[PDB]
Design a protein around this ligand. Structure first.
Ligand SMILES: [Mg+2]
Ligand SMILES: [Zn+2]
Lengths: 78, 304, 35, 50, 544, 236, 702, 61
């Protein structure tokens, strides 16, 4: 609550840079219209934003990014 | 005196032998119930289910008391048939209103059995007020638990209308349960080696002969089962009783093993390890004890 | 009962009774103004 | 704690801060323009008596 | 948006999607209904461990599980097709689902290329997610191994009942089955009960014994003269490795030492793997307690040892119950009418003494002899007298408990009291002593019409019994007005419960939404978004 | 123990007073009072509708010949067949102009209607004790039946509870604000005055303004000082 | 009231309210519709005169009074701003026919006001939902007044004549007197010095029938409001009370009453012995001085006695008819009483005499038994003669640690023989266009259909069968049976019109299985957790094994003492169930007991001593306290201590497992969003809520 | 008045039931020959429910 320079209630996203979809899922009912009016461009990191677009949340196993190393496979010959 | 009298027979034996006989009786003596029931006509004030459940538990052993052995070995079956309507006088149903048939189960013969007159003083159902205009009738048939309903037996039911039976049986067959259903003829316990039978004595037939037949059947079955008892002598798989000579440890996990080893000085329960020496077990001594106990049981029953 | 480490005890808060699960739903001027 | 009536109300003659869900909700809301319970502690009692 | 001009909130327009609590996002995007699900009543089973859950037949014959076609499983899939055990087939290269019938389909339609899959009846030891509602914390939803069972109820081990706040008076639970391979691995590791043994914050175990088991534990530690056969009868299938070193008589301490297969010391409880406390009580074998032996075993080695101890100890406790039994009777509570009559006479005398004191003060004030007290002070004095009487009853009950323990050491009710289960001097005071002052909002009931509460008392009555002080006990039986006061308290409690049930959910959801995105970064720091909240996670950078 | 016997005596049936089943008795009467007596009084009206000239030219509407009859089948037949259990009520209506003349009364018919053969009103009927309705005075009681239900159009059985009236019998007090109070009450005509008339009054008092101790209503009475109103009414 | 607010009747008080019965709904609706009818006629005539001439009355406006729609809407459940007046009857119990008509609802107040006591049941209230604290139940001794218009007028005239005749000189004070009102109509002002006499002389005359009505209410308000109020209207609560006249209990100065009470009815007592009982309404009660009991009255001095106006009846008369099913509710905690009242209505009983005739939903008990430890109210209301349970043998012990957290062990042979067996009956209804019914094509769903397109009698329907042929034209579009168990077709009724209407009644017997719910009369509810064989249960020296085993700890942790007493009394009844005349004799153990435990123990001791004259002291004590030594069936050895073991009246509730089971694999979808549909009867799925989503995120399983 | 055995112990109680319901002997005389508690309670508290005649036919069009 005291993360900013002033205390902030739990009913409002005043100082925190919450995402538009985060506000909408919290229950704002008008965040999308204001974002359209102000022309806001946002990334996709929140759990709400990830759930909206069917992405893996950055929680637990999903906190990391995975690749596949094809070097060994391409060094094998039939 | 009364048509029915409650009695007890008490004998004193070794605790383990008494427990063995009690559990053997409760496992091997099965009297079949009349659970294959078909209601052909019902314009009474009671639904089919009430009639069927009431008739399933008719105490039939007092009617078929002359065929105890074969019914116990399941070489013979029985059925009851009822057809009764309202009337001006005696507007109720007793146990004398049924008909009782014995089924040979080899040639599928169906033969009628005699009825005691005392059955005229039993009660099952009381009709409502007699109205000549309306109809109030019940008709049903019931077979014991082991019977198989095929055209061979059905062709013998000359007292029925076959078409009605076929229709109604095809209606009910899907809810009749498939497995065997039975009852214990009387109550048997053995608190601390004190073997007690709680039984019922009726006026019209001799109870001692029936008791003797049941006891003989039980003794034969128990002796055979003892003779066919084997204890694995490999490793313990935690599924059957077994013996490990390497450690000299017996795992008890069945009732007969428990009873015998306790008869020879152990103090085991039904899922437990014990340090027991299998050389102390002498089957012939156990069988002799069982035979003596059966003779004593018959002597006790004779003095009623 | 006995006390060993009472300064670290943890208290239990669990209701004994809970509500059963829900089942399927399945002019005469004759009243006061009520201002 | 709320659903098992863990807390029991009490009567007091002086200002106290309450226990239970309602007080926690009040704290979280952080509503302005209300009275606050100021406490004064000392060892010279005259300053408090005044 | 009709609401711009009007004030009706029933017409359907574009804004209806974000009307209120029934948004589209919070009812279809972060929540939904699923296909592989079930719900049913629950019951207890003694053949299921905390890691397993029993599934009824009617669910096993409907739910289906996925087998992927690859080099390892192709032949098995072909055999399943041959045996008429495949229920569905999915062609991944066409995104086409076919309902493989039983003699009502084609065999050529199947070609089993890699990446396809088939669906068959669900098999035992498959992990399934299940839980109870409301899901207040992490332990209401867990993934366990399937075991076949009888009946039409979902069977659970009583070991997890507290962690879910469940009982068997009509509760229900729900099941879901996700078969994506990543989800399968994560269910097998992260959501396994053996991994959730120790609570996240205070660290105590979340699984343990309940109810009569506790008493059994308390009794087992006290039994003294046992031969080897009786020890093995108690132990059961865990008695293979018991070592009768050189003894011929055993105690319950020997059994507990055998169960704790470790040589560890902990100030108070243990020394060289042996219990040095006086008795075994609820704090030892119940979940969420600070003296649990499973907790010490887990601290010593790992959670596997803790779960093993829980399972084994529960088994032996129930075998003790099977061998010796346990029951409370009426003759344990009230053998005769001596103590109750004594306490009743004491109450009858003391209440009248209090009334006479109050009347003397009132009469003195009514004449010009003393200045009256304030209302608050007078209430305080009366309350003090009544509280003294209540404490007198408490002391009487405690002394009676002590004396009965001396005379009749085998009292089952006092066994429950000692073990630490639901019995204490206050409850016995209610049953046998006095019911005491009834309060609403911390004060007695208020006067309403003629300065009174009920017309059984005169106007402006000062009688304490007439404002909610109950004298009788449950064994004696309350009277009509005492019953009124009792029911007043009860019904007020229930109504408050309903209102709080409404409000707490809203506050909880708000808090959960606010803190949801705070995690530990890769350096053991607590951060949210791009801000640093705390340098060291738990002050230690160790698991909580 | 005599008080216990006297209490028991109130729970048993009392044939002399027409109580055959105490637990629901007060309900049966509550319906027997309406279907037999109050309906006739409510329906049988003779009222002016319009007036002209000066109280010498007015139209009059009269209702009379009210009859109520029960069905012809038992409630079990209604349940099986799927019918409904309703009683049929019919009445005759006259609309006629009247002109006051020195010779007496002048009557000129304008219209008349009857419902002798029609479902003019269908009133749900209460089954009652023994499957017996107040209209039918049969002599057979079905045992173990206590009734208390209705059968609606779709052959569904209905049952209801009692409700508390909105009009109280004591004035309501309310603290509008600090040192400002109100006191509201109601007046209703006796039972034998058809149609019934209602009035709702409020007295307002405020410490700051003691000259405005005022009694008022909504568009039915003046706002006057209550003390002066009492002076006017009682002449004291 | 401005200066002493707490002493003036509050707005939620029952002192200032009245209640509507069945008749008043219809009366008000008739009033409103008649007024609307006349208004419409007037408007039509005015319009016709405005446009045309001759004052013509349009037809089709004086043929539709509009009462039919009003009554239909009333029975549907709409009445002004209330929506609970009427409802469809749920056929759970036979006692509901009493319980629902005697309820009183209040507009949306949830606290227990002191004025509801003694006139409403204290314990019978909803425990959860939106109705919490808004529905109350009358006591067995309460009622609601009725009065006709002619009787109203006659009574009012008599009262006015009495006032004006007997007090000619002292009814014109108007400045320092007590105003006398009849239905809030001021008719006189009495001299203060004569108030008491006026009331006393009045009440006496009321009890003799001098005014022709024995329910007139007279209240004397004296704090400083100084009023005399007389009420005669309808919709008032009234109870009988014992009269105290000049410091004297009339019941004690009427010797002939004790000898004559046997052959007299209540009204005979009122007529022949006035001044013993008075009918008092709630407002008059709230301002009187009432002694709580006869025993407490007899212990007071004459000077103390002189202050009281009435004396109350025993406490068992302050409960409803539902609460009268329970036993000794005043020996337990209150919450248990609330729950017991809630569940006593859900017990299964002999629901209807027309089990085979009525086509309705219901549940029926198959082999009923009449309880024999009861109160008088349960006997007079006939709730006892229609049965709601059976007598079963119970043992209070732990069984292998299985029966925990309210689970119970039940015996297999008890279930086989018919123990607590019920039958559930259900109603099915369909409407079919005539062409589809007569359409001539055998689909696999029409296996149970006869040649006439209707299901066959006595056949069993499955989860995919149809009851009547309905083909849309070469497709089957008929509805389907959708229960996971089968049912037998008991009755079929058909109506032929433009459409075809088919109704079917089906029945199914349901022996107990795992998950089924039972309870006792002290709110000890539990589900079946294990079905034990007769040979796996402990037994006593007579070879009796319990039908039900319940864990004993809950009895003492919840403080349901009365349960124990019940068992003892039941056991005593079994030893000697008849009077000294040989007639069946029930045992009276009322809710709100008031009798001592020692007296019950003495009664039980006498019963056993009559049964077996030769018993040792230890045996007699064991029988009285219901204690026995039980043996382990496996080893035939005793347990450590004696067990509580005996018979009790046991109830079966209506919550069955197979009615709650649900499972989904694949099915339909909602069109707009394309997700699983909803509805257990429609094969819908279970909803994965966002609290479960939070839990899964707490595991770290992304 | 319908079941032919005791539901608790399984004993036969049909003769006593006839002796009670049809011959209308005293409950004492009837119970003279019944010992078990369950059986006495069953013979003392069991009834046949009150029911009307059945409307026929069961299938009506
Ligand atoms: Mg529960
Ligand atoms: Zn019995």
């Amino acid at each position: 609550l005291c993360a900013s320079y002033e205390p902030e209630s739990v009913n409002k996203f005043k100082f925190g840079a919450a995402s538009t979809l985060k506000r909408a899922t919290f229950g704002d009912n008008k965040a999308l219209l204001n974002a359209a009016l102000h022309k806001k461009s946002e990334p996709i990191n929140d759990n709400s934003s990830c759930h909206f677009f069917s992405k893996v949340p950055n929680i637990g196993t999903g906190y990391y990014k995975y690749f596949i190393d094809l070097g060994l496979l391409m060094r094998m010959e039939r | 005196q009364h048509p029915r009298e409650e009695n007890s027979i008490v004998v004193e034996l070794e605790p383990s032998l008494a427990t063995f006989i009690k559990q053997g009786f409760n496992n091997l003596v099965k009297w079949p119930l009349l659970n294959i029931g078909i209601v052909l006509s019902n314009t009474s004030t009671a639904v089919n289910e009430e009639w069927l459940t009431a008739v399933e538990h008719i105490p039939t052993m007092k009617i078929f008391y002359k065929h105890i052995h074969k019914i116990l070995t399941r070489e013979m079956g029985f059925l009851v048939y009822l057809k009764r309507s309202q009337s001006e006088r005696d507007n109720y149903i007793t146990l004398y209103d049924f008909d009782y048939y014995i089924i040979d189960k080899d040639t599928n013969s169906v033969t009628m059995v005699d009825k005691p007159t005392e059955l005229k003083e039993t009660l099952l159902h009381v009709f409502q007020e007699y109205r000549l205009k309306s109809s109030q009738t019940i008709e049903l048939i019931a077979f014991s638990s082991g019977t198989v309903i095929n055209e061979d037996i059905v062709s013998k039911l000359t007292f029925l209308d076959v078409e009605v039976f076929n229709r109604e049986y095809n209606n009910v067959k899907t809810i009749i349960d498939p497995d065997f259903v039975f009852r214990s003829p009387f109550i048997v316990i053995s608190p601390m080696g004190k073997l007690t039978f709680f039984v019922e004595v009726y006026s019209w037939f001799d109870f001692k002969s029936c008791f003797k037949d049941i006891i003989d059947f039980l003794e034969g079955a128990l002796i055979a089962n003892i003779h066919n008892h084997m204890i694995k002598v490999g490793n313990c798989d935690e599924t059957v009783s077994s013996y490990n000579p390497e450690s000299g440890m017996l795992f008890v996990n069945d009732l007969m093993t428990m009873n015998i080893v306790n008869f020879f000085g152990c103090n085991s329960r039904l899922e437990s390890y014990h340090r027991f020496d299998m050389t102390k077990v002498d089957v012939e001594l156990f069988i002799k004890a069982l035979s003596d106990a059966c003779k004593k049981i018959l002597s006790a029953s004779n003095r009623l | 009962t006995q006390s060993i480490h009472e300064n670290k005890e943890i208290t239990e808060i669990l209701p004994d009774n809970n509500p059963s699960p829900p089942e399927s739903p399945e002019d005469r001027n004759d009243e006061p103004p009520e201002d | 704690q709320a659903l098992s009536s863990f807390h029991t109300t009490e009567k007091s003659g002086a200002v106290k801060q309450k226990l239970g869900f309602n007080e926690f909700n009040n704290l979280t809301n952080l509503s302005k323009n209300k009275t606050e319970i100021i406490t004064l502690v000392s060892d010279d009692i005259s300053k408090l008596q005044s | 948006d009709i609401k711009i001009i009007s004030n009706n909130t029933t017409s359907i327009n574009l804004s209806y999607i974000t009307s209120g609590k029934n948004n589209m996002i919070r009812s279809y995007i972060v929540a939904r209904r699923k296909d592989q699900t079930a719900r049913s009543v629950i019951g207890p089973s003694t053949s299921i461990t905390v890691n397993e859950v029993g599934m009824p037949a009617y669910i096993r014959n409907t739910l289906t599980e996925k087998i992927f076609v690859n080099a390892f499983t192709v032949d098995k899939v072909k055999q399943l097709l041959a045996s008429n055990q495949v229920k569905f087939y999915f062609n991944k290269r066409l995104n086409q689902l076919t309902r493989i019938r039983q003699g009502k389909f084609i065999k050529n339609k199947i070609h089993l290329l890699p990446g396809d899959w088939v669906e068959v009846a669900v098999q035992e030891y498959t992990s399934i997610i299940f839980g109870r509602q409301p899901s207040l914390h992490r332990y209401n939803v867990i993934a366990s191994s399937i075991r076949a069972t009888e009946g039409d109820t979902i069977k659970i081990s009583p070991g997890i009942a507290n962690s879910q706040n469940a009982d068997f008076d009509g509760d229900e639970e729900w099941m879901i089955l996700e078969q994506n391979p990543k989800a399968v691995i994560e269910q097998s590791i992260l959501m396994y009960p053996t991994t959730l043994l120790k609570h996240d914050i205070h660290g105590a175990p979340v699984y343990g014994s309940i109810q009569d088991e506790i008493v059994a534990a308390y009794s087992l530690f006290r039994i003294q003269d046992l031969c080897l056969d009786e020890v093995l009868n108690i132990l059961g299938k865990y008695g293979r490795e018991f070592d009768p070193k050189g003894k011929c008589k055993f105690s319950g301490k020997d059994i507990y030492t055998y169960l704790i297969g470790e040589k560890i010391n902990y100030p108070g409880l243990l020394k060289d793997g042996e219990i040095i406390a006086n008795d075994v009580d609820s704090n030892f074998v119940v979940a969420m307690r600070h003296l649990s032996l499973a907790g010490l075993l887990s601290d010593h080695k790992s959670n596997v040892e803790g779960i093993n101890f829980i399972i084994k100890s529960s088994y032996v406790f129930k075998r003790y119950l099977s061998i010796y039994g346990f029951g409370v009777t009426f003759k344990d509570l009230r053998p005769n009418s001596t103590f109750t009559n004594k306490l009743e006479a004491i109450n009858v005398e003391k209440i009248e003494l209090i009334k006479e004191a109050y009347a003397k003060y009132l009469n003195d004030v009514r004449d010009g002899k003393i200045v009256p007290l304030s209302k608050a002070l007078e209430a305080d004095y009366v309350e003090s007298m009544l509280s003294n009487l209540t404490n007198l009853n408490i002391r009487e009950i405690e002394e009676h408990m002590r004396q009965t323990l001396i005379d009749d050491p085998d009292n089952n009710l006092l066994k429950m009291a000692k073990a630490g289960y639901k019995v204490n001097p206050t409850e016995l005071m209610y049953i046998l002593g006095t019911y005491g002052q009834q309060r609403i909002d911390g004060e007695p009931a208020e006067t309403r019409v003629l300065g009174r509460v009920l017309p059984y008392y005169l106007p402006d009555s000062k009688d304490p019994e007439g404002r909610g002080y109950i004298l009788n006990s449950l064994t004696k039986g309350l009277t009509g007005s005492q019953y009124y006061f009792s029911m007043l308290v009860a019904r007020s409690q229930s109504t408050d419960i309903v209102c709080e049930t409404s409000r707490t959910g809203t506050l909880a959801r708000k808090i959960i939404k606010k803190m949801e995105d705070m995690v530990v970064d890769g350096y053991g720091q607590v951060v949210i978004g791009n801000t640093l909240i705390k340098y060291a996670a738990n002050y230690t950078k160790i698991l909580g | 123990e005599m008080d216990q016997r006297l209490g028991y005596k109130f729970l048993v049936p009392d044939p002399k007073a027409g109580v055959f089943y105490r637990p629901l008795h007060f309900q049966y009467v509550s319906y027997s009072n309406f279907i037999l007596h109050r309906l006739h009084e409510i329906l049988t009206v003779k009222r002016p509708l319009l007036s002209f000239k000066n109280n010498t030219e007015r139209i009059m509407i009269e209702i009379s010949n009210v009859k109520v009859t029960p069905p012809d089948y038992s409630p079990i037949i209604a349940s099986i067949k799927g019918k409904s259990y309703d009683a049929l009520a019919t009445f005759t209506v006259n609309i006629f102009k009247e002109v006051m003349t020195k010779e007496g009364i002048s009557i000129t018919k304008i219209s008349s209607y009857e419902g002798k053969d029609s479902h003019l009103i269908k009133i749900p009927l209460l089954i009652g004790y023994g499957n017996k309705n107040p209209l039918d005075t049969a002599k057979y009681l079905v045992p173990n039946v206590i009734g208390g239900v209705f059968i609606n159009k779709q052959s569904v059985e209905k049952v209801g509870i009692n409700l508390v009236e909105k009009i109280t019998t004591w004035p309501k007090f309310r603290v509008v604000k600090p040192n400002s109070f109100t006191f509201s009450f109601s007046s209703v005509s006796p039972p034998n005055v058809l149609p019934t008339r209602y009035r709702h009054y409020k007295i307002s008092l405020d410490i700051s303004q003691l000259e405005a101790l005022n009694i008022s209503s909504t568009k039915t009475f003046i706002t006057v000082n209550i003390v002066l109103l009492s002076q006017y009414l009682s002449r004291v | 009231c401005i200066f002493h607010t707490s002493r003036y009747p509050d707005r939620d008080s029952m002192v200032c309210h009245r209640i509507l019965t069945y008749g008043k709904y219809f009366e008000t609706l008739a009033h409103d519709e008649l007024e609307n009818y006349i208004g419409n006629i007037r408007n039509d005539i005015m319009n016709n005169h405005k446009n045309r001439g001759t004052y013509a009355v349009n037809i089709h406006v004086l043929t539709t009074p509009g009462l039919n729609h009003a009554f239909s809407s009333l029975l549907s459940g709409k009445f002004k701003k209330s929506d609970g007046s009427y409802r469809t009857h749920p056929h759970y119990s036979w006692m509901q026919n009493i319980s629902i008509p005697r309820s009183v609802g209040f507009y949306p107040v949830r606290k227990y006001h002191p004025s509801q006591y003694l006139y409403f049941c204290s314990s019978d209230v909803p425990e959860r939902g939106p109705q919490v604290g808004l529905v109350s139940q009358l006591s067995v001794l309460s009622s609601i007044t009725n009065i006709l218009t002619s009787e109203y007028l006659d009574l009012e005239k008599k009262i006015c004549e009495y006032i004006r005749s007997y007090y000619k000189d002292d009814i014109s004070y108007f400045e320092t007197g007590f105003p006398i009102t009849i239905e809030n109509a001021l008719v006189a002002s009495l001299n203060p010095n004569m108030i008491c006499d006026f009331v006393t002389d009045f009440r006496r005359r009321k009890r003799m029938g001098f005014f022709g009505n024995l329910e007139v209410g007279i209240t004397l308000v004296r704090d400083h409001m100084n009023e005399i109020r007389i009420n005669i209207g309808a919709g008032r609560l009234v109870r009988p009370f014992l009269v105290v006249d000049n410091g004297e209990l009339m019941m004690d100065v009427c010797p002939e009453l004790e000898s004559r009470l046997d052959d007299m009815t209540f009204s005979d007592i009122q007529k022949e012995f006035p001044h013993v009982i008075e009918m008092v309404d709630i407002e008059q009660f709230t301002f009187s001085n009432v002694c709580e009991s006869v025993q407490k009255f007899r212990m007071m001095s004459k000077d103390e006695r002189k202050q009281y106006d009435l004396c109350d009846f025993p406490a068992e008369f302050r409960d409803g008819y539902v609460a009268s099913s329970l036993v000794g509710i005043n020996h337990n905690s209150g919450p248990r009483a609330i729950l017991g009242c809630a569940q006593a209505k859900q017990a299964i009983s002999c629901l209807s005499s027309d089990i085979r005739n009525k086509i309705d939903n219901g549940i029926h008990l198959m082999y009923p038994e009449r309880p024999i430890v009861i109160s008088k109210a349960l006997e007079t209301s006939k709730i006892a003669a229609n049965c709601f349970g059976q007598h079963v043998t119970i043992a209070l012990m732990s069984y292998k640690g299985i029966n925990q957290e309210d689970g119970i062990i039940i015996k297999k042979q008890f279930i086989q023989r018919g123990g607590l067996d019920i039958v559930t009956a259900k109603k099915h209804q369909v409407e079919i266009p005539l062409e589809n019914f007569n359409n001539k094509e055998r689909s696999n769903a029409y296996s149970k259909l006869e040649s006439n397109g209707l299901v066959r009698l006595n056949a069993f329907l499955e989860s995919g069968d149809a009851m009547a042929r309905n083909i849309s034209s070469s497709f089957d579009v008929s509805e389907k049976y959708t229960d996971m168990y089968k049912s037998r077709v008991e009755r079929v009724q058909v109506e032929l019109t433009d459409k075809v209407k088919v109704r079917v009644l089906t029945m199914k017997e349901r022996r107990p299985i795992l998950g089924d719910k039972f309870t006792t009369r002290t709110s000890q509810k539990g589900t079946v957790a294990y079905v034990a064989d007769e040979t796996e249960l402990p037994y006593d020296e007579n070879g009796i094994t319990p039908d039900v085993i319940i864990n004993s700890t809950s009895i003492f942790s919840r403080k349901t003492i009365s349960m124990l007493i019940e068992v003892i009394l039941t056991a005593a009844y079994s030893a000697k169930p008849y009077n000294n005349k040989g007639e069946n004799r029930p045992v009276c153990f009322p809710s709100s007991n008031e009798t001592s435990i020692d007296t019950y123990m003495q009664f039980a001791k006498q019963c056993y001593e009559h049964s077996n004259p030769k018993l040792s002291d230890e045996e007699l004590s064991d029988k009285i306290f219901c204690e026995k030594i039980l043996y382990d069936p496996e080893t035939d050895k005793p347990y450590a201590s004696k067990v509580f073991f005996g018979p009790i009246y046991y109830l079966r509730l209506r919550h069955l497992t197979q009615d709650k089971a649900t499972v989904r694999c694949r099915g339909k979808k909602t069109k707009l969003i394309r997700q699983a549909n909803e509805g257990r009867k429609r094969g819908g799925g279970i909803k994965f809520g966002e609290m479960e989503r939070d839990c899964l995120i707490a595991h770290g399983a992304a | 008045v319908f079941q032919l055995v005791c539901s608790t112990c399984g004993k036969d109680i049909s003769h006593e039931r006839y002796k009670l319901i049809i011959r209308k002997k005293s409950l004492k005389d009837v119970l003279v020959s019944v010992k078990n508690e369950c059986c006495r309670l069953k013979l003392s508290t069991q009834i046949e429910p009150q029911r009307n005649l059945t409307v026929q036919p069961l299938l009506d069009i």
